[PDB]
Amino acid sequence: ARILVLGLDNAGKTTILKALSEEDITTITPTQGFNIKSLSRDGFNLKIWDIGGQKSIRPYWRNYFDQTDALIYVIDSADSKRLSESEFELTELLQEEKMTGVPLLVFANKQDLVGALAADEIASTLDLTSIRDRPWQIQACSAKQGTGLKEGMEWMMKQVKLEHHH
Ligand SMILES: Nc1nc2c(ncn2[C@@H]2O[C@H](COP(=O)(O)OP(=O)(O)NP(=O)(O)O)[C@@H](O)[C@H]2O)c(=O)[nH]1
Numbered sequence: 759a760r761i762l763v764l765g766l767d768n769a770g771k772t773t774i775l776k777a778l779s780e781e782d783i784t785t786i787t788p789t790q791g792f793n794i795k796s797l798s799r800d801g802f803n804l805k806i807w808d809i810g811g812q813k814s815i816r817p818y819w820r821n822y823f824d825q826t827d828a829l830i831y832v833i834d835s836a837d838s839k840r841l842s843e844s845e846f847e848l849t850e851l852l853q854e855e856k857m858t859g860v861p862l863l864v865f866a867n868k869q870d871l872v873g874a875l876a877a878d879e880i881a882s883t884l885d886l887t888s889i890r891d892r893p894w895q896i897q898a899c900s901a902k903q904g905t906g907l908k909e910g911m912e913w914m915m916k917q918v919k920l921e922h923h924h
Pocket residue numbers: 765766767768769770771772773774783786787788789790809810811812867868869870871899900901902903
């Protein structure tokens with residue numbers, strides 16, 4: 759499955775990917791273009807695209823909308839000065855024709871920091887309960903500390919799997 763990871767600059771996209779890859783986050787720098795990582799877990803082959811979020815390169819996001827199987831949107835839960843910007847960019851994404859029906863996982867990141875907003879507050883600001891056109895989930899997490907990441911990825915896998923029924 760092809761996974762696309764978006765969100766504002768500094769939200770923690772690359773740190774989450776390296777945490778999933780069991781590698782060192784000490785040496786992470788802002789992403790000028792994008793990163794690709796292949797990950798095999800629980801009988802699944804994930805190809806993950808992590809795109810840089812600085813506004814200057816944000817128009818490039820649309821290059822990667824084709825053949826997307828799931829969207830992960832990352833937000834810095836402790837940076838309330840940037841919430842309006844994060845909601846504007848997500849609402850634009852959800853109006854894209856190429857992303858019709860694609861499952862949405864929101865990672866409410868940096869829960870380890872003082873003043874981090876709870877998942878329910880973030881859900882309210884992003885107006886997630888008004889979505890009608892796709893499956894969605896919000897998950898609180900800390901990439902520095904590893905919590906929440908497994909739970910999020912398990913929800914996402916359930917949505918993209920070929921499911922067998924009786
Ligand atoms: N306290 C804390 N800091 C975090 C957490 N996740 C990431 N950070 C920090 O936040 C900063 C930005 O992380 P980074 O992964 O580069 O963000 P990004 O979303 O990839 N930015 P860009 O899109 O510009 O590449 C880094 O200093 C990183 O260590 C977290 O869960 N807790």
